[PDB]
């Protein structure tokens, strides 16, 4: 009966052991390529078209 809500803004500098365990994911505007790649390397259900929306996302749009 213990759960987490980890947060960050540059995830590439975090222990991946922990990220590995997260089931549901959320994201917002991303612009730094490194983060894009490190994320896409991990997300289960990421299509291709979706991957190209991140930079063009507005504020609040998630």
């Amino acid at each position: 009966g213990v759960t987490l809500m980890v947060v960050s803004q540059r995830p590439s500098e975090v222990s991946e052991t922990i990220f590995s365990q997260c089931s549901n994911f959320i994201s917002l505007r991303l612009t730094n390529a490194v983060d894009q790649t490190y994320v896409k390397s991990l997300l289960p259900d990421l299509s291709a078209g979706l991957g190209d929306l991140l930079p063009n996302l507005a504020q609040g749009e998630f």
């Binding site: 505007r29 078209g49 190209d52 929306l53 930079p55 063009n56 507005a58 504020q59 749009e61």
Partner: protein
């Protein structure tokens, strides 16, 4: 929000990371050259009295047959601009063909 004037061309292809424009005639290009170079900015319509701001990445001129020419441009999107003049970062919706494009005063 000021006036914009006559357009120059219209859209022919859209995508999440690319937009293409075709230009109507030559004289317009001959006139607007200085404002059609790389790096510069363009305005596009997106319906509901809005506008999209875009940048340029490539130009082209093709030869036509029956000399005369036909000009093409590529772009990249940045953000939105309401009717008032407020700039917002990131676009929510995108435009479609047969929509007009205007120069940046």
């Amino acid at each position: 929000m000021p006036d914009l004037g006559t357009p120059i061309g219209s859209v022919t292809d859209s995508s999440p990371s690319l937009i293409r424009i075709e230009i109507s005639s030559a004289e317009d290009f001959e006139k607007y050259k200085s404002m059609l170079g790389v790096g510069q900015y363009l305005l596009v319509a997106s319906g509901n009295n809005l506008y999209l701001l875009a940048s340029i990445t490539g130009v082209r001129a093709t030869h036509v047959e029956r000399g005369n020419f036909r000009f093409q441009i590529d772009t990249q999107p940045i953000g939105t601009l309401s009717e008032d003049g407020e700039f917002s970062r990131g676009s929510h919706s995108l435009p479609v063909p047969t929509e007009y494009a205007y120069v940046t005063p």
